[PDB]
Amino acid sequence: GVACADCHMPKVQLENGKVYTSHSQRTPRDMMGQACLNCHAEWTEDQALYAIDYIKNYTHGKIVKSEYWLAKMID
Amino acid sequence: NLKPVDAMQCFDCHTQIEDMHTVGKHATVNCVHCHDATEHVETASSRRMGERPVTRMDLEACATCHTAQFNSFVEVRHESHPRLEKATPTSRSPMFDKLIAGHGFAFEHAEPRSHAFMLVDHFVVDRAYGGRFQFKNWQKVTDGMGAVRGAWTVLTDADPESSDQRRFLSQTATAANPVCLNCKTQDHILDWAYMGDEHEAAKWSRTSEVVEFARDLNHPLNCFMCHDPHSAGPRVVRDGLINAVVDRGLGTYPHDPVKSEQQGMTKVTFQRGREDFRAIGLLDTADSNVMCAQCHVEYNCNPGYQLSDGSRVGMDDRRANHFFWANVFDYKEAAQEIDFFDFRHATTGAALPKLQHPEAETFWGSVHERNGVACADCHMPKVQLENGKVYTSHSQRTPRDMMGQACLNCHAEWTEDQALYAIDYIKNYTHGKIVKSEYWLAKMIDLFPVAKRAGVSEDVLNQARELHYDAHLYWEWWTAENSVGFHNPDQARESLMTSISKSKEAVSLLNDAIDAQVAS
Amino acid sequence: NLKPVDAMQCFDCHTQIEDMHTVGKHATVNCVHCHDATEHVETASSRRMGERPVTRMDLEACATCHTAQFN
Amino acid sequence: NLKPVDAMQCFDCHTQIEDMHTVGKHATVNCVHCHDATEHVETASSRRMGERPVTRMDLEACATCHTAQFNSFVEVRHESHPRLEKATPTSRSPMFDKLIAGHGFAFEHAEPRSHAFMLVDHFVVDRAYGGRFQFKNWQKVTDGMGAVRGAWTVLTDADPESSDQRRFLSQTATAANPVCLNCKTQDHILDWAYMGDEHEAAKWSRTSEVVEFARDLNHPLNCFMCHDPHSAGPRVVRDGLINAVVDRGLGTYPHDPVKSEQQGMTKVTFQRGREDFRAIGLLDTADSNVMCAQCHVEYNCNPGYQLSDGSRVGMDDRRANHFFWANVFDYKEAAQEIDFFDFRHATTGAALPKLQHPEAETFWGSVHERNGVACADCHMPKVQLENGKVYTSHSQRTPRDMMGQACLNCHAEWTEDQALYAIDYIKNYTHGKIVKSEYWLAKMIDLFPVAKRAGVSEDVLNQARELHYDAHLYWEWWTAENSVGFHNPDQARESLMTSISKSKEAVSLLNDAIDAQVAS
Numbered sequence A: 001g002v003a004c005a006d007c008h009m010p011k012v013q014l015e016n017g018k019v020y021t022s023h024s025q026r027t028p029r030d031m032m033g034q035a036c037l038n039c040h041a042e043w044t045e046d047q048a049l050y051a052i053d054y055i056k057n058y059t060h061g062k063i064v065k066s067e068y069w070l071a072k073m074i075d
Numbered sequence B, D: 001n002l003k004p005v006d007a008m009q010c011f012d013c014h015t016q017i018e019d020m021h022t023v024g025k026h027a028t029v030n031c032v033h034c035h036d037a038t039e040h041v042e043t044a045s046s047r048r049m050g051e052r053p054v055t056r057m058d059l060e061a062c063a064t065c066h067t068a069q070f071n072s073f074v075e076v077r078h079e080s081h082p083r084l085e086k087a088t089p090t091s092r093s094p095m096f097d098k099l100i101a102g103h104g105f106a107f108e109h110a111e112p113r114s115h116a117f118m119l120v121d122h123f124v125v126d127r128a129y130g131g132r133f134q135f136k137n138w139q140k141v142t143d144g145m146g147a148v149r150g151a152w153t154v155l156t157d158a159d160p161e162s163s164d165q166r167r168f169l170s171q172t173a174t175a176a177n178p179v180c181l182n183c184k185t186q187d188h189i190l191d192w193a194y195m196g197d198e199h200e201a202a203k204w205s206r207t208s209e210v211v212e213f214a215r216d217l218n219h220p221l222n223c224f225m226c227h228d229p230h231s232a233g234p235r236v237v238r239d240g241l242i243n244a245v246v247d248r249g250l251g252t253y254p255h256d257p258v259k260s261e262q263q264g265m266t267k268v269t270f271q272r273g274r275e276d277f278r279a280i281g282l283l284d285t286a287d288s289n290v291m292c293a294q295c296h297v298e299y300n301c302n303p304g305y306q307l308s309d310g311s312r313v314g315m316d317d318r319r320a321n322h323f324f325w326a327n328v329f330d331y332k333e334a335a336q337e338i339d340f341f342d343f344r345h346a347t348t349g350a351a352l353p354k355l356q357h358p359e360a361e362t363f364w365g366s367v368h369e370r371n372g373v374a375c376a377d378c379h380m381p382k383v384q385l386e387n388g389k390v391y392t393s394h395s396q397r398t399p400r401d402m403m404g405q406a407c408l409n410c411h412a413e414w415t416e417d418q419a420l421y422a423i424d425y426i427k428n429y430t431h432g433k434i435v436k437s438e439y440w441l442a443k444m445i446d447l448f449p450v451a452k453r454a455g456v457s458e459d460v461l462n463q464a465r466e467l468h469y470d471a472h473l474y475w476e477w478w479t480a481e482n483s484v485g486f487h488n489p490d491q492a493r494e495s496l497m498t499s500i501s502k503s504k505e506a507v508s509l510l511n512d513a514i515d516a517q518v519a520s
Numbered sequence C: 001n002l003k004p005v006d007a008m009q010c011f012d013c014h015t016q017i018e019d020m021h022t023v024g025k026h027a028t029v030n031c032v033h034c035h036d037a038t039e040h041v042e043t044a045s046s047r048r049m050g051e052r053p054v055t056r057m058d059l060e061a062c063a064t065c066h067t068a069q070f071n
Ligand code: HEC
Pocket: A002, A003, A004, A005, A006, A007, A008, A026, A027, A028, A029, A052, A056
């Protein structure tokens, strides 16, 4: 039941104030407290960032190998 | 969901509001945002109110369309230390207890904190309601948003079944009275006659039971204190200020008739039946100096005594709600004009004045004021954004937190460290002279018991008491004023040197008299 | 300074808009905030547009009441 | 390399140790880690010690298997300012010299610093040994690890050839006595009888030469003060605490019989021949409130006088080692029960009590204590690790350094800045009332010489001296206590207002009496 806004345009957190919805649609790296760690209480910011990077590093590896094999065929 | 009402129908009986609403930047804002008038409209005539319509005084009535201004206002500055007593060696007045003995401030006088807390802090300080009111627990002291929502959401009353002012703990006082509240809230703006005079249409007045009045009030610093809700234009609502500037003809800048004319005020009066009831002051310009002067002034808001014969002046007297609208060098004359003083010193017996936060009257004539600078320029500047719509910060706080926007934009010749160093030069020099003024006041005060016990004459003691009035005035102005000299450094210097001069004259007088009695 | 128009006059021909506007959280927001329709009202019929009204598409039309979301 | 001994052989004569060692989490830890008993075993019988075996009291005996707990304990908090005198305008008690005149604390009373230094700081403070002991040079003041290794590795004695207490510099005192050391070290745990009573098997007692005793002691806060070395289970070893809780039947929580029963203590006694000698108190739970109460309490550890007739109470009397185990409102009654006071004020002549660091007795009844919170939760929390084996921090320090683990885990509604602001509200308010209490005490004290010289009667002066006892008690409790109100803010408030009330009553009494003598 999670949606794009939960990670990319979360509610602002304020010590004292009227809450509103951030309209800065951007990577959760800039707002990890609101976009990630409120749900994932078991993690620190560095741990959550490490989990993102594990996926991105593995996927990019396979994109590069896919391109190597496509290029070999094309040639 | 709000449903709009027929404003044209309202205007068939409300021509005064029509002329303001239809012309300003709130012409498209429907009455339903701030009034529930359904039963009123069913029962009223042009000459009979019928059912009383409800008017919203909560700040959220504005925050719906003006969130940025609301959020910047309610922010709590945690570096503004809370509940910090001024009568301590590390704060503003190390010898305050000796010097103020006989006044209610001896029971407690803390430094200011953020605006969100003004109403709740008024209710809980030890000198105000005998300790009747407390926060619900010690955690609630952090809750600025809660305070704004309503004082009674965060506070408790020790005895809901009684309405008298009394002590609930031993070292408290009951200094609070209805006039105080006019600089904490304007929730009562439709239930209080101009100056708090008695009036058939007023629920509350100068002579009301302040505990009953307190329970009817909720919100701090209403947004409409500086902004008319109907025209959206700049104004003041504080009665005592309108009385000084307009009724007494002193002007917005008493020392500058030209500036007074260019940046003036127009008094607008509202009636109940055919009798005048309340008033506001529309400003010619969006002048923060006069907006902030609704509260950041020296005032009377309390009973006292007459200088002429020593008789009591009670809350029923118009002098119990008074803006002196005078600088430190004109104050004694201003107090003589209304034949008034605040208290008799517990040790010396002198009639003395009580001074409070005179920022507005101090700023007059300073280099910044003479160059057209105003409170807002240093304390609520425009926000600077790389990409965005500009608005005015409503977080009214020290410029130390925003030096780029509140200082260095004007002073391009300085780095932030240099500007801070210039501030500190003034504050350090001024504080040194406050501490020396207190040393000499204390030395004089301590001689009074010695002189009395030595048999010094009442004529000599009265001469010394006359010097004490001046020695006190020219010192306390500066512990009362919040800038530690920054708003007017040359004036602070001249005043504090005058205080020390007066104390020294009294010390010499008394020492000579004691020595003469010993010799005899 | 904006001056409000009579929405009821618009609603006579614009029932779909009436049904949406009167029910939601913009029921108090006047048409003048986003439309200039004076000549339109003078020339339209129930089925023909007449002179075309101006409609504001700029984001600042929302920014005066919703600055935080705009910024 | 250590070589294990036959524990079963030891147990043939040591059944008491067997029953503790074989059951707890030290069942596999061999005696050789802490005892050298080779000659003992060759010469002993079940009824004759033979050669005395050596027992290790150094903390490194535990650090070998428990490095993390040792290192967190010995860490020095450099932000805990060292050798900082409390009797100064910027510290805890700006008027302490006037108020404490007649007591040894006038010579020096610094703020606390890290636990590693407790024994060395006791030895070098100006009020303790007449300046006999110093660090070897001013560089050694930084060396926490060295202090833990042994006091005499970092200190020098001005005269190794004499053992009397005397002044080596003019503005020092000789307040130290053997009872003090029980809250600095337990190196003497096998050489001191319960309460320090005289005993044939005790090398040291209440009446020993404290300079000779000092030279036999080395380590601060031994690890076994809270942990039995044989069972590894939770305990206390401090005699005065066991006496209050068990012997006098007051319980671990005197204000809560149920909590006292659930979180109780069992006294275990060890004999020398057939005579009782020493004792410990095994705890039902690992209760840090009671562990920390071995030292963070108000106590007697000094000679004094009787309230009844003014006669001397010397170190030989059991009252020279006493835990009152009473809150501020029960203390006067507790002192009357043992017919005791500490000193006569140098100016007023009043019999007065001397109060010291009553954190444990202050915490009772506070909102945190009533909700089951304990000292450790705020001052030595569990460590939080992304990946690792959890242990308990032994760096017993302010929660300001670890707000995430010592505050915000419970208070999820707050940011760190908000929690700090709540602490500061309490401390600022409490400090203001301490400063005002001192102002009024000082005003009263200064009237005593005036009254005496005016010929005021002894009956009036004695009435004033009775008020001084209470005015002092209800003030000094809070300068002595280290939280500046945080541990119990409502109690501090009620107490300080009582002090001011008492001082004011005395000031009025004396002023009226002086005025009457002048009039006559
Ligand atoms: C949290 C569970 C997420 C959900 C829900 C959505 N997105 Fe996402 N997105 C997420 C991460 C961790 C990342 C990588 C960010 C990084 O800095 O490594 C992304 C990435 C994007 C991007 C690229 C952003 C950039 O590179 O700056 C886009 C444009 C994006 N995501 C879009 C998007 C949409 C449309 C979503 C709803 C269908 C959506 N995201 C959900 C995390 C999460």
